[PDB]
Amino acid sequence: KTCDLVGEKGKESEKELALLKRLTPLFQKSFESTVGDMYSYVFRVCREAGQHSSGAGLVQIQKSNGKETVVGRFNETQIFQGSNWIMLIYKGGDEYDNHCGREQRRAVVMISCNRHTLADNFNPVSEERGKVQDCFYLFEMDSSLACS
């Protein structure tokens, strides 16, 4: 299984399919947040990032008790690009219980161009959980694949 885009299989956006193809070299990799807090984050491109076979593309692990929360699933992927960046979004994460109208969590990853690395510097920016809807966890990473 890989990233699933909106639309029927084989009928998805050619623009999105092309971007997934471009990021293929990153599928085998795993990315983890730094700083050594309370939560750690693990992110993968179109592959299982969690340890519970939940279909997670990005997970949040609470350090004190090992709780793994799915932030976004790769079976609900959106991907687009600009001049020197690529935005990847995984929807369908575990539902909130007291924020955001109890909607499913979502992960938004901004990949910026960096000619010096295939991929690195992955880290969370912030979590927007103060809205009535359309909340999300925001992350950033660098990759030469985002360059033009």
Ligand X SMILES: O=P(O)(O)OC[C@H]1O[C@@H](O)[C@@H](O)[C@@H](O)[C@@H]1O
Instruction: Name which of 64, 51, 61 is nearest 124 in CA terms.
Output: 61
Residue 129 CB, shortest distance to a second copy, in Å, is 9
Pick what 103 binds: Mn ion, a second copy, ligand NAG, none; C-beta below 5 to 8 Å, kind-dependent.
Answer: none
Instruction: Name which of 86, 50, 52 is nearest 71 in CA terms.
Output: 50
Q: By C-beta, is 54 or 110 nearer to a second copy?
A: 110
Instruction: Record the tokens describing residue 9, joined without a space.
Output: 């299989």
Q: Which residues contact 95 (CB under 8 A, 6 or more apart)?
A: 102, 103, 104, 105
**Segment 64-123, which members bind a second copy (CB under 8 A)?**
78, 80, 82-85, 110, 112
Q: Is 130 exposed, middle or buried (0-12, 13-18, 19+ CB in 10 A)?
A: exposed
Q: Is 60 in the site for ligand X (CB under 6 A)?
A: yes
- Give the count of alpha carbons within 13 A of 123, CB side only: 6
Q: Is 18 in the site for a second copy (CB under 8 A)?
A: no
Amino acid making up residue 16: E
Q: Which of 73, 108, 122, 143 binds ligand NAG (CB under 6 A)?
A: 73
**Segment 2-41, which members bind ligand X (CB under 6 A)?**
none
Q: By C-beta, is 37 or 97 nearer to Mn ion?
A: 97
Q: Is 127 in the site for ligand X (CB under 6 A)?
A: yes
Residues that bind Mn ion (CB under 5 A): 97
Q: Is 12 in the site for a second copy (CB under 8 A)?
A: yes
Q: By C-beta, is 76 or 142 nearer to ligand NAG?
A: 76
The overall longest dimension of the chain from CA atoms, in Å, is: 44
Applying CB under 6 A, which residues contact ligand X? 60, 69, 96-99, 127, 129
